């Protein structure tokens with residue numbers, strides 16, 4: 158198996174830890190962990206293109222989109238590779254994450270390692286919000302916390 | 311060209327920004343930036359195996375060593391891929407980094423992207439310290455600041 162990890166931090170109270178595991182080369186990737194400090198509700202959750210945090214999370218650029226597609230949800234054919242949808246926090250401010258995705262990878266052209274995982278201000282509308290920005294970012298707003306995805310033991 | 315970047319942070323005052331640029335696939339990598347908050351003198355400077363900062367910089371593991379060599383300096387044949395020697399801080403606690411290295415890469419088996427860059431407490435003795443640990447870590451002590459190396463625009 159191949160494994161990766163990401164520590165999420167930002168300028169505010171949001172922080173977390175997300176693990177990735179890919180049992181077979183090019184197979185599905187399990188994504189699991191926990192994010193705290195969040196407002197109750199949905200928070201967009203994406204791999205962005207660059208692993209650059211020079212100026213904070215903004216330096217990561219747009220969503221990771223090697224195939225030059227429009228934004229969508231993880232279940233959609235038409236999505237960015239980095240489109241992992243939303244995490245959902247309760248009143249406790251915690252989202253307990255447990256996803257499997259078959260588009261992201263820990264190897265090859267769709268490898269997310271060395272790129273930035275971001276948790277966003279508000280909901281990702283999965284490309285269904287009815288403006289041009291929906292089909293780019295999902296209208297998920299600002300970047301509360303982020304980290305560079307790294308190779309794990 | 312291929313580019314990468316690393317933001318160095320830790321639990322104390324040490325922080326910095328380091329850029330990587332590789333003009334050609336097989337070719338040397340230029341490494342430059344700035345680190346502040348240091349004591350005067352040498353601080354070991356290495357790429358460590360894992361891009362895992364879960365528990366802080368300790369989580370990054372040993373020096374990156376895809377060839378199972380012993381520890382040395384960047385100008386030695388016998389070195390870990392991750393052996394970038396020392397940065398040197400003046401009285402103001404700033405080290406101004408500008409080197410070139412032919413062993414690290416931003417692609418392939420020698421790829422440092424997705425791994426952790428670390429600045430250490432103490433001098434790296436470049437494997438010349440006369441003890442077993444010298445040829446493993448260079449006796450560079452604890453990890454003052456680190457970051458995961460990410461793909462840059």
Ligand SMILES: O=c1[nH]c(=O)n([C@@H]2O[C@H](CO)[C@H](O)[C@H]2O)cc1F
Pocket residue numbers: 340341342343407408409
């Ligand atoms: O060794 C270097 N040091 C350095 O500071 N740079 C910076 O990177 C830019 C050029 O790529 C700026 O000219 C310069 O400040 C590049 C280098 F290659």
Ligand SMILES: O=c1[nH]c(=O)n([C@H]2O[C@@H](CO)[C@@H](O)[C@H]2O)cc1F
Pocket residue numbers: 176178187188189190254255256
């Ligand atoms: O939500 C989770 N999903 C999950 O797969 N795991 C586990 O995933 C396993 C991979 O076989 C373990 O590495 C363990 O981290 C833990 C979790 F909390």
Ligand SMILES: [Cu+2]
Pocket residue numbers: 201202203204205220275276277
């Ligand atoms: Cu995002």
Ligand SMILES: [Cu+2]
Pocket residue numbers: 354355356357358373428429430450
């Ligand atoms: Cu080191």
Ligand SMILES: [Zn+2]
Pocket residue numbers: 203220227228229236237239240293294295
């Ligand atoms: Zn997207």
Ligand SMILES: [Zn+2]
Pocket residue numbers: 356373380381382389390392393446447448
């Ligand atoms: Zn070494």
